[PDB]
Amino acid sequence: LTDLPGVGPSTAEKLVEAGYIDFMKIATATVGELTDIEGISEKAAAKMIMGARDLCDLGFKSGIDLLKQRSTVWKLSTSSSELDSVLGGGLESQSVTEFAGVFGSGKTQIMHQSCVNLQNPEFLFYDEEAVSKGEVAQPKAVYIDTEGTFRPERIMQMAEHAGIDGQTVLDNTFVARAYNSDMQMLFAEKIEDLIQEGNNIKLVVIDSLTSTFRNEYTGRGKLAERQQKLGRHMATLNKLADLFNCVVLVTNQVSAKAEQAIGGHIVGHAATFRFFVRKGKGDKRVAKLYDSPHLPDAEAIFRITEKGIQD
């Protein structure tokens, strides 16, 4: 931190105590939030922000540099060949991927499978030239369980069939049971603390994204209140994905009129990739990608078995 203009040993202390230990967090901060820190004046705040941006080289980029930025995105395999294909390789870091669908479609299964897959080095696809082995080493997951359906048994079973050690997945997966939207949002905001404590959080799961909000703000005469809170939550998730180069996955429920993911416009805008998971015959499932910034809408057929997600 003292590498930053105006920042001395004392100011560096104030910053770390305030939660600002990374150059990127400072470069992307507002004069206000920094001035909210005791002895940090407006000029000092503005000076260190500009300095952090410079050190992080956050200016105009063009040509090959645009490809290099895109190469810092790594992807997590879903264990499904067709789904990985529709995803353009796998679940993308630096983005929010939403899986919506009717009950029993497999949303929670995909979340569990992702926590397991994170522990298989060969399931993280990346360009070694842009992403070092160290950046994805000792990856850990955060599972914000809003519906109380996290199941250690399922983790162990999926791990076993993948040839991975179940206990290792549990040891490297943080689960936070949220009973309402306030806890849900706070847990998400506190993931930064886990990072600061030395945990390489590379996967963040929110299951479910909207169930709490939908139950707390029912009156359609309070919908604005809900969309605002939902918007702040989504903003935290997106920034989280970018600053810590991790994949963020969220599940969403559906309502009639055929079906549409709930959460309104804000969720639609904030989500990067949007899927509708449908049920086929027996254990067959169809993941339909209907929105993304660079991939064509497409369908991926897969199955949910005792082994987890397969095909």
Ligand SMILES: Nc1ncnc2c1ncn2[C@@H]1O[C@H](COP(=O)(O)OP(=O)(O)NP(=O)(O)O)[C@@H](O)[C@H]1O
């Ligand atoms: N141990 C298992 N072995 C085989 N199939 C399983 C196992 N556990 C769950 N399933 C399948 O997973 C389906 C449920 O997946 P799940 O991801 O929980 O649905 P969901 O979309 O999240 N539904 P909901 O929480 O109501 O929105 C079941 O109905 C089972 O067919």
Ligand SMILES: [Ca+2]
């Ligand atoms: Ca992003």
Ligand SMILES: [Ca+2]
């Ligand atoms: Ca259910």
Ligand SMILES: [Ca+2]
């Ligand atoms: Ca079933």
Ligand SMILES: [Mg+2]
């Ligand atoms: Mg579920």
Ligand code: NA
């Ligand atoms: Na096994």
